[PDB]
């Protein structure tokens, strides 16, 4: 009857590292191998209470008694130095390959049916729509999350590393490439074919991505903020902790990964957002709203069962999304 496997699991392809950030001056960014790092330091902030009243305590007495007791914090900031106007974010990317085979499967019948379906997809049309959009998200610096929103000029350099040295150098201007359109460029197609050859083959493909952002002298950069619970006691507790790998601020690896998977423009709602990240039941945690609900037949699970079990091959955009979920990885399975 070809029932679904009870255990399904895919390894994460497109594996990025922790994006270190450093600082320096623009127009000597070519010799940016010995730039010093951006360090996370504490600063103490205070202010009054700004949020809305709970409507039963609106009286002026406790209002003025509340603005005479400001809250006191100790936050972390990461600032550029006062003699540098460029933020240099650099991380390494591995495109692994073998993007169809599950890392765990109960049924061998489900396994070779799914492998046949993935092979049917890749010889019908290879990874050339997905790798185009992955090369877009590496081209326009979407991995610079809040570090992008006011920059004068962003330039992204991607160098494909061979066994020991740079096999092919790219150079982009991330502000000329928008955050919502996936057009066609020559170097974008060359990078997309490199990611395609990575995703199809068996060996890994290593990429080094550098992103310079010309913000300004001494402005604030924004690394990842560490999710900690059970924080402690209010005399010594810190309110906001930034990520730091080895005394140097850094964006988390999964934040870079969530930036690179922003290719999903095929969700049924209107694209006032544009592309979102690829998730089963595609949910935007900044929006708080889970698109691709299971009541419509456009989530990942039902699309995969219709593509493998009962062989209803959906629209080519939806199987692009399905193979994007398979490159994303995941742990699927009922009881």
């Amino acid at each position: 009857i070809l029932s679904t496997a009870s255990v399904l699991a895919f390894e994460r392809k497109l594996d990025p590292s922790d994006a270190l950030m450093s600082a320096g001056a623009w127009a000597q960014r070519d010799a940016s191998q010995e730039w010093p790092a951006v360090t996370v330091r504490e600063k103490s902030v205070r202010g009054t209470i700004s949020n809305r009243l709970k409507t039963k305590d609106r009286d002026p007495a406790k209002l003025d008694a509340s603005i005479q007791s400001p809250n006191l914090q100790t936050v972390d900031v990461a600032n550029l130095p006062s003699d540098a106007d460029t933020l240099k974010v650099r991380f390494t990317l591995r495109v692994l390959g073998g993007a169809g085979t599950p890392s765990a499967c109960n049924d061998a019948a489900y396994r070779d049916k799914l492998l046949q379906t993935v092979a049917t997809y890749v010889n019908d049309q290879g990874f050339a729509e997905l790798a185009r959009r992955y090369a877009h998200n590496l081209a326009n610096a979407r991995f610079l999350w809040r570090n992008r929103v006011g920059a004068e000029a962003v330039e992204v350099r991607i160098n494909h590393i061979r066994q020991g040295e740079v096999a092919r150098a790219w150079r982009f201007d991330a502000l000329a490439i928008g955050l919502r359109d996936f057009k066609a460029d020559a170097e974008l197609d060359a990078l997309a074919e490199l990611i395609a050859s990575g995703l199809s083959g068996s060996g890994h493909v290593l990429l080094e991505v550098v992103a310079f952002a010309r913000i300004g002298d001494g402005q604030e950069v924004f690394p990842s903020q560490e999710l900690i619970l059970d924080k402690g006691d209010k005399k010594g507790q810190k309110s906001k902790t930034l990520y730091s790998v080895r005394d140097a601020a850094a964006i988390h690896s999964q934040k870079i990964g969530n930036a690179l998977r922003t290719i999903d423009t095929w969700y049924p709602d209107e694209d006032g957002l544009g592309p979102i990240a690829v998730e089963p039941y595609g949910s935007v945690t900044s929006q708080g709203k889970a698109y691709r609900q299971p009541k419509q037949k456009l989530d990942f699970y039902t699309l995969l069962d219709n593509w493998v079990l009962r062989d209803e091959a959906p629209a080519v955009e939806q199987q692009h999304y399905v193979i994007a979920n398979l490159i994303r990885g995941g742990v699927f399975g009922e009881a």
Binding site: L227, I228, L229, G232, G236, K238, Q254, E279, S283, T285
Partner: peptide, 23 residues
């Protein structure tokens, strides 16, 4: 890891999971 304020032991820095299908 990170040591919370006023304790001797340590806790772990976690990752942010995606939401469920309801938000």
């Amino acid at each position: 890891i990170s040591q919370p304020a006023g304790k001797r032991t340590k806790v772990f820095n976690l990752t942010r999971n995606p939401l469920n299908r309801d938000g």
